[PDB]
Amino acid sequence: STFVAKDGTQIYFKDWGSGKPVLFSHGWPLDADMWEYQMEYLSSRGYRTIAFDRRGFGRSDQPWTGNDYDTFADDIAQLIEHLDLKEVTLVGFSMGGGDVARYIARHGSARVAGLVLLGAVTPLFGQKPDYPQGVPLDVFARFKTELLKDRAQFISDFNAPFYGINKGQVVSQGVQTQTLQIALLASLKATVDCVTAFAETDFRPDMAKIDVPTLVIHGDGDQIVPFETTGKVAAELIKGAELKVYKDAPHGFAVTHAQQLNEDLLAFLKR
Amino acid sequence: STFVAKDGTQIYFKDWGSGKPVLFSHGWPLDADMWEYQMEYLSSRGYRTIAFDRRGFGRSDQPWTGNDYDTFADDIAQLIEHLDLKEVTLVGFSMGGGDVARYIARHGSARVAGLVLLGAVTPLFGQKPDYPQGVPLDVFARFKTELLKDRAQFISDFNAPFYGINKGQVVSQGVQTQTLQIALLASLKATVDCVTAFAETDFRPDMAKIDVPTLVIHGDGDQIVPFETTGKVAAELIKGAELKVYKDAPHGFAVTHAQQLNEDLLAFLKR
Amino acid sequence: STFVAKDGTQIYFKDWGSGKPVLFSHGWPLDADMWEYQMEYLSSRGYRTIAFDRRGFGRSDQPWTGNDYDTFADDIAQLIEHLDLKEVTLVGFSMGGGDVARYIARHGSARVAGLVLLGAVTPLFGQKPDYPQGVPLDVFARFKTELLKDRAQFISDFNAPFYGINKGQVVSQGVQTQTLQIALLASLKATVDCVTAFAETDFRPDMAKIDVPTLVIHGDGDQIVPFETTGKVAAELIKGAELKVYKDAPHGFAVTHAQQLNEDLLAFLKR
């Protein structure tokens, strides 16, 4: 399926099954297919599961402009509006934790029943003057430099620390292939703009606007989005939030811990 | 090209050349590109070739519901109507043999000039109380369990018996890459439901409804869809059917025996 | 984005940034993504960049008919008219040099600020009775025969002489993957017809109609499109043309010499 955003960007999404809806927001630089197992798991147990390809990724159009969190939150708002969702559980992985938080910050939670932040960059990823523990911007600057030389090989090399293959996790070549194949669909410009946006965007104000039940899940072996400065703080700052830490889990834990994730998502929806 | 099925599913197809139409139905888990050489061969020799991506595969939408043979047969009907095709030769590979046969069973053959069943699951694939010689459902249950753990690696390992490479067939890396690339485009859900549909659907009644010239072609080294309980029996159950057995051919014989198959399809069309 | 060509073919394109327009025409058997680094480089320095997937390639429709340079040139005119472009700098790579020149030859240069020919097939690639120094038709006849047996493997093997990996150039496995993945998107029919087209189309008359500033760039290690009989001649035949030769560069120099091409394209646009 598709809808057209305000600026004319056509955004691809899947909408599977029926019941109360769970809307999924993928991480970088993947697309709605990273959720396919969570979606099959939940839609075949009575939920409606929806997942889109963020502008610039997967099967969506690749606009030059709007590759920023306010546009991404507003893209989400249009999707929810288009389908008239109500009592939606918002589920965001990695950079996709930020646009689901920023949807709530910019639009309220009238349509929202719950929030799940998975290995998410919230509340802040890169350094700020009062957040020196964040990741230095120079790290992201180098990533952008390498992306602008060879993004194919950069993503292919990203597989190991993403999935923690360098730390003993076991992930098939098949999954590594599909990861790279999906990433290559994406726009170079969107791929690079998203690094800027997630390096620099401060979601600490969004944390205070979150007034729904919230489950934060993070692997403490996460090489890409460090638990101590993201998920751990997001749980503390969101009033009432629950935290689950998957021990030694990597960033790609929707793959390596798929069953555990599925069950935790089901438990959360049934609380 | 696209057409929209009754439930809203957009379905991609290619429509090449001009002349009497030949409409191709692909097997699992592929899409219309598995036919590209037969299409080029026939459309250079004065036939119109049409091939669609089944719903849930390739460039088509991925609906949660309708991944079943009657819906597949009805998709094919809407394609035939959408184009107003007449004297169509229906060609189905593998699971694709069932939906061209179910099309005729549900809609009759008024539009149909002839039927080709290639490495096809007809008349029946899995076991039934009166057909213990079919493949036990257990076997399919395990394929499903594995696909629901890692479909990428499952399809990757599927290349070997599909093509008979595990038994010595020689098939390039490029073929194997393109095979997985196409597979990964499909829906997890459609990919899993098709196994259920092809394991359990009985096309014996459909065989009695086929009243057009029919050529059944099957490799007798087919490790995926065994010759003895499928093509062999389809050729006997269909009044007037002709049988060709490609000696030592694997399941993926549209690749390993492409030239032979092109010539047979051309000779059938010219009879 | 997409527009619809005269014959109904839908053609995908990207249109990034704003400013004076630069319109890119990819080579064989690639798509608009081959320009993503030039596009990002120029669009973030004040230029509008536009690049399309040729009919039969990438995300565009795969028509059986029209795979010829006059049609390719008219597709480009319809894009230019669709976007109402003025003072456009046309940039063509490899076979893509041919449809931008043919566009000038058929439509005039009223809309055109400039022409850049990169590793281009212009002014003529294959032999003619007055050009035995061209590549013999037999060579393209054999390529076609191989493409019509296994285009997946043929493009895979094409990576090496394309990038000059066999003559010590260094190109990552990620770029070779991406190149193959993009290639597999294309039609078998378009992939083969384009060989016919670039083998046999004479663009010498087009050279005499080019009355805009022109930069010709070629690598003199090009193993695919021989510098001596294409780019070197094109620069001589086009009045006022400037020539740059990238020493030992391969055909795939938009990758191996990306930064240098970027700077040269920027310098040309600022001339």
Number of domains in chain C: 1
Q: Where are the alpha helices (DSSP H) in chain B?
A: 36-43, 69-83, 96-107, 137-163, 173-185, 188-200, 204-209, 231-237, 253-256, 258-270
For residue C158, give the amino acid letter: F
- What are the C-alpha distances in Å from C212 to residues A113, A146, B256, C118? 62, 36, 52, 16
- Whichever domain contains C230, its CATH number is 3.40.50.1820
> What is the C-alpha end-to-end distance of chain A, expressed in Å?
31
In degrees, to the nearest 5, what angle opens at C-alpha B118 toward C-alphas B115 and B122? 80
B4 touches chain A (CB under 8 A): no
Q: Where are the alpha helices (DSSP H) in A67-165?
A: 69-83, 95-107, 137-163
Contact criterion met (CB below 8 Å) for A193 and A119: no
Contact criterion met (CB below 8 Å) for C171 and C255: yes
- A 18-47: CB under 8 A from B: 36-37, 39-40, 43
* Composition of chain A by helix, strand, coil, percent to 5: 45, 20, 35
- What are the C-alpha distances in Å from B48 to residues B79, B181, B266, C269? 14, 27, 12, 47
CA distance B178 to B33: 10
Tokens of C154: 């043929």
Resolution expressed in Å: 2.2
Question: Using the beta-carbon criterion (under 8 Å), do A37 and B154 form an inter-chain contact?
Answer: no
Tokens of B94: 């593998």
- Asked if the peptide bond before residue B123 counts as cis, ω within 30 degrees of 0, the response is yes
- What are the C-alpha distances in Å from A228 to residues A125, A216, A252, B57? 11, 13, 17, 41
Question: Using the beta-carbon criterion (under 8 Å), do C189 and B36 form an inter-chain contact?
Answer: yes
Contact criterion met (CB below 8 Å) for B80 and B23: yes
Interface test with A, best of C36, C37, C256 (most A CBs within 10 A): C36
Domain hosting residue C161, numbered range: 1-271
Tell me if residue B230 falls in helix, strand or coil.
Answer: coil
What DSSP string runs through C12-71? Answer: EEEEES-SEEEEEE--TT--GGGGHHHHHHHHTTTEEEEEEPPTTSTTS---SS--SHHH
Question: Using the beta-carbon criterion (under 8 Å), do A36 and B189 form an inter-chain contact?
Answer: yes
Exposed, middle or buried: residue A8 (CB in 10 Å: 0-12, 13-18, 19+)? exposed
Q: Bridge-partner residues for A137, per DSSP?
A: none
Question: Using the beta-carbon criterion (under 8 Å), do A36 and B188 form an inter-chain contact?
Answer: yes
Pairing of strands C47-52, C10-16: antiparallel
Interface test with A, best of B53, B55, B64 (most A CBs within 10 A): B64
Contact criterion met (CB below 8 Å) for C112 and C45: no
- What are the C-alpha distances in Å from B64 to residues A50, A255, B56, B189? 11, 22, 8, 7
Q: Tokens 């460090």 label which residue?
A: A226
A95 is in an annotated binding site: yes
Q: Shortest Cα distance from B14 to chain C (angstroms)?
A: 7
Quick one: angle between helices A173-185 and B137-163, nearest 10? Answer: 70
Exposed, middle or buried: residue B206 (CB in 10 Å: 0-12, 13-18, 19+)? buried
CA distance B156 to B29: 11
**Nearest Cβ partner for B181 among A36, A172, A181:** A181
- What are the C-alpha distances in Å from B14 to residues B24, B36, B137, C64? 10, 10, 34, 9
Chain A residues in contact with B151 by the CB 8 A cut-off are: 174
CA distance B105 to B154: 33
Q: Where are the alpha helices (DSSP H) in B44-187?
A: 69-83, 96-107, 137-163, 173-185
The CA-based diameter of chain B, rounded to the nearest angstrom, is 47
Tokens of A23: 């809307």
**Nearest Cβ partner for A177 among B64, B152, B188:** B152
Q: Shortest Cα distance from A137 to chain B (angstroms)?
A: 35
Buried-state track A120-145, b at ≥16 Cβ within 10 A, e below 16:
bbbbbbbbeeebeebbeeeebeeebe
C150 touches chain B (CB under 8 A): yes
- What does R_g of chain A's alpha carbons equal in angstroms? 17
CB atoms within 10 A of CB B145: 10
Do you know the residue count of chain C? 271
Tokens of C74: 């008219």
Note the Cα C103 to chain centre separation in Å. Answer: 13
Looking at chain B, which residue has its C-alpha nearest residue C147?
B37
